[PDB]
């Protein structure tokens, strides 16, 4: 199974440096070219750079030349993207990708790591239950005032997935994010089954398991 695991992403102040890494597994590392591609809403997709794991030779997009350095460690099956002098314009999800030969189309992509370039500080969310005072009933969780993005929400440790609606985060006036996670369940289960939402905001290491009681 081919997998490209990215790390080193997160919040960085403007003018700051970040080093992204991509652990490659499930294939012969030195047999394919490795790349970094970035995504930003409204801006679309942009090829950043490529490195040949066999030689160590790397080619950069003229916008990122000098500013970013792409190295590799064959013994560790990891490629590194040193990103220097980061600006707000650099805020994007950075993807690790694989290609073969002179054809730069990418068959395998990593999960993507979000890089947030901001002067603001890390703030964990406050987690509050959403419970009511027919056949179907709704219950949820309010994940309020956190920075930076993202947050993950699961219900009953990942057992409950159907009818789950985790709303996109809304940026508030304060510069802090806020979101809601809801779930539609049968009304008869409210008194016989326990509903717990599990919230994880990795930047602040806040892991909350809130029980929702009607």
């Amino acid at each position: 199974e081919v997998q490209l695991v990215e790390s080193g992403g997160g919040l960085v102040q403007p003018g700051g440096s970040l080093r992204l890494s991509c652990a490659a597994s499930g294939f012969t590392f030195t047999d394919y070219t490795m790349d970094w591609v970035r995504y930003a809403p409204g801006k679309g997709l942009e090829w950043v750079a490529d490195v040949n794991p066999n030689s160590g030779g790397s080619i950069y997009n003229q916008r990122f030349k000098g500013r970013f350095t792409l190295s590799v460690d064959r013994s560790k099956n990891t490629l590194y993207l040193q990103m220097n002098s980061l600006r707000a314009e650099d805020t994007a999800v950075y993807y690790c990708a694989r290609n073969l030969g002179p054809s730069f189309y990418f068959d395998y992509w990593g999960r993507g790591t979000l890089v947030t370039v901001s002067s603001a500080s890390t703030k964990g969310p406050s987690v509050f239950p959403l419970a009511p005072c027919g056949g179907t009933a709704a219950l949820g969780c309010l994940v309020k005032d956190y920075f930076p993005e993202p947050v993950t929400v699961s219900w009953n440790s990942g057992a409950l997935t159907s009818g789950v609606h985790t709303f996109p985060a809304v940026l508030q006036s304060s510069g802090l994010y806020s979101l809601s996670s809801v779930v539609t369940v049968p009304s008869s289960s409210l008194g016989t089954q326990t509903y717990i939402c599990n919230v994880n905001h990795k930047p602040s290491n806040t892991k909350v398991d809130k029980k929702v009681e009607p």
Partner: protein, 213 residues
């Protein structure tokens, strides 16, 4: 740099329709064009390479055609799971540029929202703030209005709404409207309500609660 211009920027089509997305190159690229599918919160998936060659495991409905400067991606029979942003990419000339993308939305039958209201929690009230949430579940089309009332008085500038991406299975949208008030403002009133207007509803719907019940 070679520009890759996609047309249209967005489109809507019913399940089973033939969808046609075009890509224009600023100069000749022969058949060095790839197509990708990017679903929300997911990494782009490779669909087509060499302008017409379909990648392994890609459904038969997806097909590419064209050479030189004019390229097309076709979905023979649109499915509810095909909701995504599609990108063309020229890959034989550096810096192997991608098109802006085309957001494919699914047209479906009108579906009325199931509306729910949530009072601020006891845990939140000890923090000096109060959030009242109004949920509009699984509806079509995307257009819906949510009005807030406190002690039968219309609210303005103190609510924020969030809409989920089109559901990959039933092609419906969900909305949440959060009314934010101070603990003081919440403790000085009793009736809290949200009025929902949507095409699937014959007349507006109201959900409400009385603080201290």
């Amino acid at each position: 740099d070679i520009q890759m211009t996609q047309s249209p920027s967005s489109l809507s089509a019913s399940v089973g329709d033939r969808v046609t997305i075009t890509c224009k190159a600023s100069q000749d690229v022969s058949i060095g064009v790839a197509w990708y599918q990017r679903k929300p919160g997911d990494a782009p998936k490779l669909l087509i390479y060499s302008a017409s060659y379909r990648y392994t495991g890609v459904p038969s409905r997806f097909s590419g055609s064209g050479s030189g400067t004019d390229f097309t991606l076709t979905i023979s029979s649109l499915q509810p799971e095909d909701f995504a942003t599609y990108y063309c990419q020229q890959y034989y000339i550096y810096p192997y540029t991608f098109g802006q993308g085309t957001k494919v939305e699914i047209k479906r039958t009108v579906a009325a929202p199931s509306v729910f209201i949530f009072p601020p929690s006891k845990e939140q009230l000890k923090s000096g703030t109060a959030s009242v949430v109004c949920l509009l579940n699984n509806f079509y089309p995307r257009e819906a209005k949510v009005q807030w009332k406190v002690d039968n008085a219309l609210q303005s500038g103190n609510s924020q709404e969030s809409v989920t991406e089109q559901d990959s299975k039933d092609s419906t949208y969900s909305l949440s409207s959060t009314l934010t008030l101070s603990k003081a403002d919440y403790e000085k009133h009793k009736v809290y309500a949200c009025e929902v207007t949507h095409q699937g509803l014959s007349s507006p719907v109201t959900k409400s609660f009385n603080r201290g019940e």
